[PDB]
Amino acid sequence: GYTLWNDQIVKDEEVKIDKEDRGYQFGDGVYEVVKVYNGEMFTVNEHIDRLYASAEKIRITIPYTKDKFHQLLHELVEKNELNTGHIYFQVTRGTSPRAHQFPENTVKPVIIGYTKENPRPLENLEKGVKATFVEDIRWLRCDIKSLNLLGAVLAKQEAHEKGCYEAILHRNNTVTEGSSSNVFGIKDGILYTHPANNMIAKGITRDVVIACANEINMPVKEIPFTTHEALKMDELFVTSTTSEITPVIEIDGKLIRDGKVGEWTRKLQKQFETKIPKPLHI
Amino acid sequence: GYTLWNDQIVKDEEVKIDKEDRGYQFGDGVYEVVKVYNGEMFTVNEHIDRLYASAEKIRITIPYTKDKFHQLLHELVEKNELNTGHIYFQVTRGTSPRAHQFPENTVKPVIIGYTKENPRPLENLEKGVKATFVEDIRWLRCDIKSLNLLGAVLAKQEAHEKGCYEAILHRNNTVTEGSSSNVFGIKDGILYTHPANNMIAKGITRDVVIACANEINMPVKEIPFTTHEALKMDELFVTSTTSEITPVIEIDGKLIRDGKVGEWTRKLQKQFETKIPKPL
Numbered sequence: 201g202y203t204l205w206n207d208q209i210v211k212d213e214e215v216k217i218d219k220e221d222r223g224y225q226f227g228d229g230v231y232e233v234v235k236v237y238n239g240e241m242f243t244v245n246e247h248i249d250r251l252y253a254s255a256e257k258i259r260i261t262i263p264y265t266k267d268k269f270h271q272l273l274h275e276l277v278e279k280n281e282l283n284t285g286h287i288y289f290q291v292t293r294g295t296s297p298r299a300h301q302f303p304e305n306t307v308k309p310v311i312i313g314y315t316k317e318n319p320r321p322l323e324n325l326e327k328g329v330k331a332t333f334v335e336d337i338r339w340l341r342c343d344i345k346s347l348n349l350l351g352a353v354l355a356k357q358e359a360h361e362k363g364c365y366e367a368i369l370h371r372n373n374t375v376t377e378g379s380s381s382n383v384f385g386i387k388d389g390i391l392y393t394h395p396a397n398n399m400i401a402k403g404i405t406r407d408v409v410i411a412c413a414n415e416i417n418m419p420v421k422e423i424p425f426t427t428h429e430a431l432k433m434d435e436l437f438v439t440s441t442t443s444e445i446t447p448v449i450e451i452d453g454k455l456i457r458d459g460k461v462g463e464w465t466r467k468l469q470k471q472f473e474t475k476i477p478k479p480l481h482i
Numbered sequence: 483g484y485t486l487w488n489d490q491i492v493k494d495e496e497v498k499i500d501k502e503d504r505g506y507q508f509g510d511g512v513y514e515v516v517k518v519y520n521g522e523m524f525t526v527n528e529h530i531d532r533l534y535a536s537a538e539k540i541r542i543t544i545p546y547t548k549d550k551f552h553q554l555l556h557e558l559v560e561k562n563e564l565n566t567g568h569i570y571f572q573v574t575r576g577t578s579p580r581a582h583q584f585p586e587n588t589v590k591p592v593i594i595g596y597t598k599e600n601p602r603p604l605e606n607l608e609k610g611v612k613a614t615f616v617e618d619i620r621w622l623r624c625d626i627k628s629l630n631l632l633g634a635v636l637a638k639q640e641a642h643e644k645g646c647y648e649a650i651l652h653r654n655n656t657v658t659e660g661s662s663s664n665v666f667g668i669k670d671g672i673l674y675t676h677p678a679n680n681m682i683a684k685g686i687t688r689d690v691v692i693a694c695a696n697e698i699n700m701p702v703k704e705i706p707f708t709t710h711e712a713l714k715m716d717e718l719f720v721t722s723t724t725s726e727i728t729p730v731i732e733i734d735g736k737l738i739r740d741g742k743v744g745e746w747t748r749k750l751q752k753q754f755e756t757k758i759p760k761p762l
């Protein structure tokens with residue numbers, strides 16, 4: 201198909217990554233994933249804002265404005281003729297002879313973006329999924345969505361091998377987030393989740409779900425909870441751009457309540473659905 | 483020059499990295515740096531053993547045996563006519579459509595290796611350097627020499643900005659290692675350095691230095707020391723394949739003892755020197 205390369209949408213074959221691209225040697229870069237529904241991008245501006253915020257945290261200067269980045273994503277969706285799926289885009293410090301310290305400010309960051317056709321996870325949304333607990337051994341700046349994703353890779357692989365969908369990470373027995381999602385717990389009609397500090401990524405879907413809870417008049421408490429407390433929740437679910445609101449019904453062979461999707465998860469899902477881009481008559 | 487791309491030696495210009503190489507999207511790979519002295523590779527078997535150990539820790543199966551890999555490195559040095567400098571090489575899990583979990587075991591690892599002429603840091607080995615303390619916020623698996631190096635990048639740049647040569651890292655005041663080196667402290671002729679656990683990289687230069695210490699009958703204690711204890715050391719130095727034995731004479735304005743390279747550091751440097759290749 202076509203790939204965004206810096207500021208040009210070019211055929212995939214034209215793209216050339218250099219061996220000393222800092223993203224290849226130090227994982228020196230940041231990324232974002234945006235869901236596209238029937239041709240329209242969901243919450244694109246929030247993701248672009250976060251891309252800039254992550255880049256800014258590690259002192260990378262994106263050479264163009266948010267408006268130009270947005271136009272390029274639009275063009276990218278159109279050229280690839282993406283119906284339902286997602287856009288993946290990343291920015292690295294640039295190509296420079298291998299050295300740990302930042303290169304001279306004359307080095308231009310490398311931007312890469314591409315699309316993939318991928319359906320909404322129907323079965324998962326309806327039946328819920330199994331999860332497993334994995335110790336969070338990642339670095340202390342999890343608030344930065346960088347390319348240093350080796351801990352997440354190891355965690356997801358561990359979940360996958362046990363037949364689970366997601367690994368629920370925990371630092372010092374406190375549940376932080378999943379390897380590629382945020383974690384939510386429901387107890388007596390109250391919504392709980394780890395606050396957005398350096399221990400987790402402040403997911404866009406996480407914010408959309410909290411906004412949804414406020415809308416259905418559901419109390420939200422951003423307080424962390426332990427593994428022991430999670431297993432005692434009435435409901436539990438994970439959120440991500442691609443997972444939306446995916447119910448977790450079992451953790452390591454222990455059912456969350458009766459092993460069925462809860463009433464509040466369902467409500468939150470119905471409210472989330474009103475935000476997804478759709479026509480008016482088609 | 484020429485680059486080692488998998489098992490072939492190709493001209494730099496021909497090497498192309500796929501946008502979906504896991505090393506590019508997840509830092510999913512491991513690397514080594516081997517010093518070359520007058521055409522001879524220093525402690526190559528040790529770096530090769532460590533490359534395979536690092537790969538094994540994150541379950542990457544390198545398609546070549548150590549003998550083939552050794553043979554390939556030699557060809558690389560020869561083709562590039564490397565006299566004194568280093569070889570950099572890495573292995574990533576391979577190219578696959580973006581997904582966090584491992585690809586189908588059919589996917590092959592991508593191997594990249596290249597050389598660079600680079601003289602010994604003679605000026606620093608004699609004069610010593612300045613360092614600064616930076617909180618270690620890296621992950622808990624520092625024993626794996628992976629491409630996830632953003633923590634070391636930020637630490638090196640902070641030191642670089644204060645005019646310092648290396649950032650000495652610490653976990654809640656306990657000294658671990660440097661951004662790209664291991665830290666050693668000397669007090670009353672006794673050598674101190676953080677033990678080789680999940681908190682640091684088990685440097686090859688570090689192990690050579692400890693071997694040098696055993697050779698000159700200097701007591702070695704692998705016990706962690708605090709940032710405050712380090713400032714009260716008689717001597718201090720960092721080691722890395724490229725830094726060899728670099729004396730640290732000042733940390734954050736506070737000089738170590740007198741700000742002169744100590745006597746034991748000098749004895750270690752001399753014993754180290756007996757090991758580096760010096761053919762005519």
Ligand SMILES: Cc1ncc(COP(=O)(O)O)c(CN)c1O
Nearest residue numbers: 380381382401403404405440441
């Ligand atoms: C570590 C981590 N946490 C949470 C998320 C989910 O955030 P978002 O809702 O913005 O997809 C992701 C990205 N999928 C992630 O990589």
Ligand SMILES: Cc1ncc(COP(=O)(O)O)c(CN)c1O
Nearest residue numbers: 662663664683685686687722723
């Ligand atoms: C974190 C870390 N510690 C120590 C070292 C130096 O050890 P070696 O002698 O094996 O280069 C390095 C060099 N890459 C390093 O990155």
